[PDB]
Each structure stands twice: as C-alpha cells, then as structure tokens.
Amino acid sequence: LHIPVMVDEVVHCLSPQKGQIFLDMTFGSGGHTKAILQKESDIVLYALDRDPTAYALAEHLSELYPKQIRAMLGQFSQAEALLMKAGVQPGTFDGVLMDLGCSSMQLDTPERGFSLRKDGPLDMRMDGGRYPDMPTAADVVNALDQQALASILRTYGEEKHAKKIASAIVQARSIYPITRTQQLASIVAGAFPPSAIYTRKDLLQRSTHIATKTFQALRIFVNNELNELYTGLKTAQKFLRPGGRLVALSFHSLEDRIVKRFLLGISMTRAPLMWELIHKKVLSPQDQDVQDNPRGRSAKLRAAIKL
C-alpha cells in the first residue's frame, strides 16, 4: 500500500473548509483526493488525471460522495478546455493540488511498463490508450538518433554519461526491437561494466539500478510532463481564486525547478511578483515516514497563495 505523500501537510496547508471549491489536477490513485474529502464533509472538489484508469477510479469513487467529488480526464494543457466546458472560467478555486510524478498504481502494475524491475511492455505512458497514437517509450528509443536520444537522458534523467547510454540503445535496437522494460534495463546496464549495475546509490545512500534515472528520462519525454507542468500551473493560476492556497508536490528537483520559479515569478531559463509562500520550506517527508514510503523521499512541497 502507498500512503499519500505528506497528506498531513497538504491537508493543513489547504485547510479545506465549508463553502470552498477545490481542484485536483492529478487524481491518480485518489489517496490525497480522499484525504481532502474526509476532513471537510461539505467540501466541493474537482478531479483530473491523464490516465483513464485513474479517471475510472474517481468515477467508481464518486459513488462514495455523489457531488462532493467530480471526476475529469485529460492532461494539464487540456484541463482548461475541459473545465471551460463546465463554464468555470474564473474558477474561483480556493486551492489547486497539483501532485506530480507517476502514480503508485501506474508503477505497481507491471503491465503499464513503468517498472524496470518487473517485465512489462515498454509503454511508460501515463495515458491508458485514450490516445492510441501517443508514442510510447519503446518508439522513442527505436526512432531517435544518438544525438537526439542523448538529450532526453541528459536533461530529463540527469544522465552524466548521455553519449554512452544512448549509443548502446542505438546498437541494441538495430539487432532487435526494444519492446520490454527488462530489455531496456539490460541494454542500459550493458553500457557500463557488470559491477556498475547497482553501484549507483539513491539520495538516501541506497543502491539502485544504474538505469533507474534513464527510465525517468523516457517517462518525462513520453508524457511531456515538464512542458505540461508549466501550462498546468499557469492554468491553475487563472482558475485559482485570489487568496487561494496552491500546493504542489515536486517528487524530484527537476520538476521542482518549474514549480520553484513559477511561484517566485523567476524566469524558467521587472513586474512585481504575485504569490505569497505561506510554506516556503521545500522539505522531504519525515525520515520516519521516508523509510515507510521510500518512493516519496524526494517529495518537495511548494505552497503559495495567489496575489
């Protein structure tokens, strides 16, 4: 089981109260969405996700609360249009909870292709076939040249040896198609000597697979999470009420950079800033909680109020 990351902080931070309407741009499993519908029984909430499986969960969970939760499906960019069809263009949303990253269910189910440890089709796509033409990670690795493929790993994955892990993929694809997660992991791990398979260690000084970050890179480029994160934050601001508390959760510093600067009005690469950081601190969950849920160790919560 996966406990919602920093659920206690996010609930206190948004202080859901009667007469307030809230939005959730990443319903996913719904642990955070349900923790918010428990504190305030009179709350009004809107949900959204890129995964139709995640949107079905919300629809099934809508039975628990008929109207307090409203389920929606679509990307961050398509969220404004989807919500504009409802007609809440001003929105006056008291808070927008923009949780980020991959869902626990998405990466716990091997079929979805997100887990390198297990054996599933190399999808790595949050989309659940809602757009059957959306390229999957397998297509990205088999099509892009070394120079192009390196860029994805170098930036999205923070891959220092971008040229090395990219050449191996180009050679492997020519011999046979790259269609499975374990196949990709072996291809990336072959770039380095056999010792290097688990030499790299996590931020907690815990050994991890050498290709762990490589999968993150392909995950971000298949789902264009970074570009969709900029539009999602911008759309939230337009639909966010004045004096309304926004709360994001940047699992990695990479996406945190966009959240870090957007709230501070700093150039992603003068007019007055329009945000109030009630909870400036960007801190991981309690160390006691990190061990229980290591997946969320790097969760950096950036809260702000619209000005």
């Binding site: 099509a143 192009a148 539009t231």
Partner: protein, 53 residues
C-alpha cells in the same frame, strides 16, 4: 535632463524545457508512420642508426 521635453505626463514551452519536444515528437511519429589506447615511445629512447652508418 531638466531641459529635455518629456511631453504631457500621464513561443514554445519546449525552449523553456531545454529540448524541442515538438520537433522530436514529430520525428518519432514519422518513424511510426513508416513502422505502421596505444603505446607511445619515450622520445629520449628513440633508436638511431647514424653511428652504425
């Protein structure tokens, strides 16, 4: 400044990310359309035959 006359007084987010996500997305889609060291001697030790000649 005092003498001067002031008159009557009153486009892709891909670049921000750092990679051209759109062009690459097209490139993969286009592919999908078709789918469906050596030793160096010390200079001082270089051998010569001038004396032997």
């Amino acid at each position: 400044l005092a003498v001067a006359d002031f008159g009557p007084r009153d486009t892709t987010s891909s670049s921000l990310c750092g990679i051209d996500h759109e062009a690459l997305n097209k490139q993969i889609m286009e592919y999908k359309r078709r789918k469906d060291g050596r030793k160096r001697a010390k200079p001082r030790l270089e051998q010569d035959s001038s004396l032997k000649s």
